[PDB]
Design an enzyme around this catalytic site. Structure first.
Site, PDB file in Angstrom:
ATOM      1  N   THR A  88       0.872  -1.197   0.000  1.00 56.29           N
ATOM      2  CA  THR A  88       0.000   0.000   0.000  1.00 56.29           C
ATOM      3  C   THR A  88       0.887   1.216   0.000  1.00 56.29           C
ATOM      4  OG1 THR A  88      -1.895  -1.006   1.180  1.00 56.29           O
ATOM      5  CG2 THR A  88      -1.646   1.437   1.293  1.00 56.29           C
ATOM      6  N   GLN A  89       0.460   2.226  -0.743  1.00 59.64           N
ATOM      7  CA  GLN A  89       1.224   3.435  -0.876  1.00 59.64           C
ATOM      8  C   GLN A  89       0.301   4.632  -1.039  1.00 59.64           C
ATOM      9  OE1 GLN A  89       3.052   1.555  -4.791  1.00 59.64           O
ATOM     10  NE2 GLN A  89       2.511   3.700  -5.267  1.00 59.64           N
ATOM     11  N   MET A 137      -1.601  -6.160  -2.560  1.00 56.46           N
ATOM     12  CA  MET A 137      -1.760  -4.979  -1.727  1.00 56.46           C
ATOM     13  C   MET A 137      -0.678  -3.937  -1.962  1.00 56.46           C
ATOM     14  SD  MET A 137      -4.501  -5.198  -0.176  1.00 56.46           S
ATOM     15  CE  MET A 137      -4.542  -4.086   1.239  1.00 56.46           C
TER      16      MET A 137
END
Lengths: 233, 244
Positions: A1-2, A107
């Protein structure tokens, strides 16, 4: 995730009787700071495909590299690389779509909204969208982000359903798109006046126009507007 | 005693690695192939023995491209050649990925060199059964190379390997002497087609198919391309003519 840092706004497109047109401005925003102005977000692949990218720019550059590799790789031990076995727009799209979905499934997404525009070997127009969620869809017109809300409504007034494609000329189509780019410059706070536009026609091939500008803007009426209600001067 | 030639990384009393030498025999037993360095590029050509009329002409391509600016041809066990090229390809992609710029020919040559040399370090692997002629154009010129099963390689003006390597080498040495100023890509292509026809005498029993490729800064833009159609036929003739 970013989280996306440098970003590209809308990517608008539509198909006409002999091909497809796609455009995107040349801006790379950094939050509310309009930081970079020479960013090309239209990525030509071969001469029958153009991939328009919005969203995170570092990921866009990564997709760029992926695309150059596809070309190199497809050429390996391929005597028909520039003929029957050259990359089709549909191959390029299925590839990216595959990657986008695998990355969201781990993800760790490629924070982008992509539209692949091109002409198949049999002449068919190709226009499909894929985003960071791996979601994909086709429509006579396709736009990402902001342009989905403001460009599609305009472009759909030209091509509202499939039967409208054969009745649409490159001139009408290019006109619609150019107008849409102007509207986006009027209401999108993350847009630029400069943009690139590309056409992929089953006859004239790929035409890539750089350094275009929104022109013929209406601002004169602004002089007649003063105050916010009762003020007279 | 004896038995020094049964395991791959073993030194014989005279300091040789017999398995590598036996690999060479497989190479000498193969089709002849060559490379010619010209004033701004390189040309590759190979002999394709036509086992029978059943082989679809022009279909079984032997020359291979690495990245977009490198050509590789080899004599010996064909599969081993492909294996080496697949590696070269990963090797080239890795380099570009990290450094952005496409891999320089010298750098590429060593990548292949270290890998081939690696296969002479253990008895759990067999040496490569091919000699490879490869090269291309980069930031500073054209480069030609030949790599032996020992991992040994050097830069060449011209190179040949396989059945008719002697004929070819002989012809190549002539060119070198009669052209101290440098051959042109256009000329090298013809010259190459000839050398191959000549060297085909050491196998004059079977009919063959010619294959050429080149990479010239001026003729191909520094990209590796196969010689086809007119340019190919023109070279075929130039050879067929000087073979009599």
């Amino acid at each position: 995730t970013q989280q996306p840092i440098v970003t590209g706004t809308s990517v608008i497109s539509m198909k006409y009787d002999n091909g497809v047109i796609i455009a995107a401005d040349n801006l790379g925003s950094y939050g509310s700071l309009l930081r970079f102005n020479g960013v090309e977000r239209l990525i030509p692949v071969g001469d029958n495909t153009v991939v328009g990218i919005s969203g995170d720019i570092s990921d866009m550059q990564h997709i760029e590299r992926l695309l150059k590799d596809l070309v190199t790789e497809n050429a390996y031990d391929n005597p028909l690389a520039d003929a029957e076995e050259a990359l089709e727009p549909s191959y390029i799209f299925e590839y990216l779509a595959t990657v986008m979905y695998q990355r969201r499934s781990k993800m760790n997404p490629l924070w982008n909204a992509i539209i692949v525009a091109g002409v198949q070997s049999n002449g068919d127009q190709f226009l499909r969208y894929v985003n960071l969620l791996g979601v994909t869809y086709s429509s006579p017109t396709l736009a990402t982000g902001f342009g989905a809300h403001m460009a599609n409504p305009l472009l759909r007034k030209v091509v509202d359903r499939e039967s409208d494609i054969p009745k649409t000329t490159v001139q009408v189509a290019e006109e619609a798109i150019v107008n849409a780019m102007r509207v986006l410059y009027y209401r999108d706070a993350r847009s630029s006046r400069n943009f690139s536009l590309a056409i992929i026609d089953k006859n004239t091939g790929l035409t890539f126009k750089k350094n275009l500008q929104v022109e013929n803007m209406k601002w004169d009426f602004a002089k007649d507007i003063k105050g916010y209600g009762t003020q007279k001067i | 005693g004896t038995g020094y030639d049964l395991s791959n990384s073993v030194f014989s009393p005279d300091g040789r690695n017999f398995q590598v030498e036996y690999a060479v025999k497989a190479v000498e037993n193969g089709t002849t192939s060559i490379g010619i360095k010209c004033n701004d590029g390189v040309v590759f050509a190979v002999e394709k023995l036509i086992t029978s009329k059943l082989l679809v002409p022009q279909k079984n391509v032997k020359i291979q491209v690495v990245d977009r600016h490198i050509g590789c041809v080899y004599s010996g066990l064909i599969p081993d050649g492909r294996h080496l090229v697949n590696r070269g390809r990963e090797e080239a992609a890795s380099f570009k990925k990290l450094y952005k710029t496409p891999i320089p020919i010298p750098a590429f040559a060593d990548r292949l060199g270290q890998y081939v040399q690696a296969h002479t370090l253990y008895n759990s692997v067999r040496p490569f059964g091919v000699s490879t002629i490869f090269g291309g154009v980069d930031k500073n010129g054209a480069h030609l190379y030949m790599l032996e099963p020992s991992g040994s390689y050097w830069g060449y003006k011209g190179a040949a390997t396989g059945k008719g390597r002697q004929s070819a080498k002989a012809e190549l040495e002539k060119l070198v002497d009669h052209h101290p100023e440098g051959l042109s890509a256009r000329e090298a292509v013809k010259q190459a087609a000839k050398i191959i026809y000549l060297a085909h005498e050491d196998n004059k029993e079977k009919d063959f198919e010619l294959e050429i490729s080149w990479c010239s800064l001026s003729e191909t833009n520094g990209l590796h391309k196969f010689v086809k159609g007119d340019l190919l036929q023109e070279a075929i003739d130039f050879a067929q003519k000087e073979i009599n």
